[model samples]
Target: DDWRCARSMHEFSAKDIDGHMVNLDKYRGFVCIVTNVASQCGKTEVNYTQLVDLHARYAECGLRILAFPCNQFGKQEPGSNEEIKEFAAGYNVKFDMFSKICVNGDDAHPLWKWMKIQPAIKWNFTKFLIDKNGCVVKHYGPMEEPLVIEKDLPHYF
Candidate 1:
């Protein structure tokens, strides 16, 4: 089936760590990384560190990192929204993080449902690179380091 659509991420909205509904349109015109994150997964340490660094390194250039904590994978992120926010703060994650959500399954968040092209999310830290127009440009597995993914960004910016 033909699956491409004209929909951009601006059509989606999600709750922030504090439960406020955040409009994705706020990130319009900025390149973004949309990733599922966890506090205890093995990939967490490196992903968080580099993500923070990436955000710090390019935020002024209009690069935004949006993290969504999910407990669907191994229950590794079994923390309350408040606790999840605290954990991310411990890593000095200044990027925007959302309320925990299911990234796969019938109950997956609508945004995820819309974004997935194939092979549903298998673990925490699975990332999607979205261009300034809010269309996904690439998908990266949990094992891909944030810095390594940086190479695909300049073209979009």
Candidate 2:
């Protein structure tokens, strides 16, 4: 179902939490960690804690955490955009936060569809790491804790 979604993430656009249009192309030279987040994931307690910390520590190294919360996983993120923003704030996530999107099914966003290129998102916290070149470096599962990923970031950072 690729259908023409760009191989690189650069060719996509989505509104931010404030409804400001954001273009993926703007992050062309940055290392991006794109995640489908939820407030109630099994490891939310630690994942978000590490994610926010990771964002702060690596942001200067060109790491950008792009979170797109989805309620598709067990209805775990069932919240309006405002509630979502508030929830993320509770976790102190300072990276880019986009409007909530469907990660699977007919209504899935094109970027999500493009990233799948294979299977649909299995759950919240599914992570897709994109290189400065806009190519997908790796796609991590929810179980891959954020701190565990810190070990792998030296190669890219």
Candidate 3:
């Protein structure tokens, strides 16, 4: 079933690079971009750079990105949380990166399951945009550029 626009986005907690629990509640009232990422995918660099740009552009306006590393595709992302953090930092990525998690299959993370109940994530880099009230407002495929959604973000802030 698709998520109801009136329903709040599911609350979740995941470990960060430092292994500390990162709570989703901290982003309440902000627009959130959540993506499932694979480091070795052909589009990985583009997606990461775009996300960095997105964060840099809208951070002051309350736009936050929560990127989760996944290995479901081509077994591309085989790094630990710390390693993934280092890779992102090397690219000057300033968004939130979480612990590795499965985005599909029986072992899929609960947040991912919640995500799939709406529109499924077809591949790495699929993005879900959540409004200030924490309800998902849009879903984008990996091929979509972040700039395409930039204009719609201000309305949420």
Candidate 4:
């Protein structure tokens, strides 16, 4: 392992869009793609579609996506909780979505802080893949399309 390879998401708990709190403990032993999303970016449509697709394909096989909306970039996701949910509903998003959050700097969610040991997130749709053991694996950038990544995900299953 690199000197920086190890990190944990266990102590970090966050709220859902509905204001319900959650912790990684509930997802223990599940392969998870924890991603930062924005509602109004050009990338939003494809990412939301693919996230829903992947969950449909793998949920029964143990994959779960935890989406976190962030308004920190370009103010692209400028909506209230209900609005965000309604907008996502239009796209048919089926995975678990968290409350809107900041993924970088001082106000970041505790989990996002730990996830960033991948080294600062550069844009929306940045993904942190966690293995069934709850260990952080690969960190995919915004440009890394889910279609490209899902081909390699079965190995983890």
Candidate 3: tens digits of C-alpha lDDT, residues 2-58: 322324554665676567887767878889998898788999888888889888878
**lDDT for 130 (candidate 4):** 84
How good is model 2 by TM-score? Answer: 0.93
Q: What order do you get sorting by lDDT, best first?
A: 1, 2, 4, 3
> How far off is residue 64 in model 1, in Å?
0.3
In order, what lDDT does every prediction score? Answer: 0.89, 0.84, 0.80, 0.82
Q: lDDT for model 2, on a 0 to 1 scale?
A: 0.84
Model 4, span 37-91: residue lDDT tens: 9998989989999988998999998998999999988898899988998888898
> Which residue segments of model 4 deviate by more than 4 Å?
1-7
Cα deviation at 155, candidate 3, in Å, is 1.9
Look at candidate 1 and tell me the lDDT of residue 66: 92
- Report the C-alpha displacement of residue 87, candidate 2, in angstroms: 1.1
**What are the root-mean-square deviations of the candidates from the true structure over C-alphas?**
2.6, 1.8, 2.9, 3.4
Candidate number with the higher lDDT (2 or 4): 2
Sort every candidate by TM-score, greatest first.
Answer: 1, 2, 4, 3
Between the candidate structures 1 and 3, which one is better when assessed by lDDT? 1
Task: Point out where model 3 deviates above 4 Å.
Answer: 1-6
Q: Which candidate's lDDT is highest? A: 1
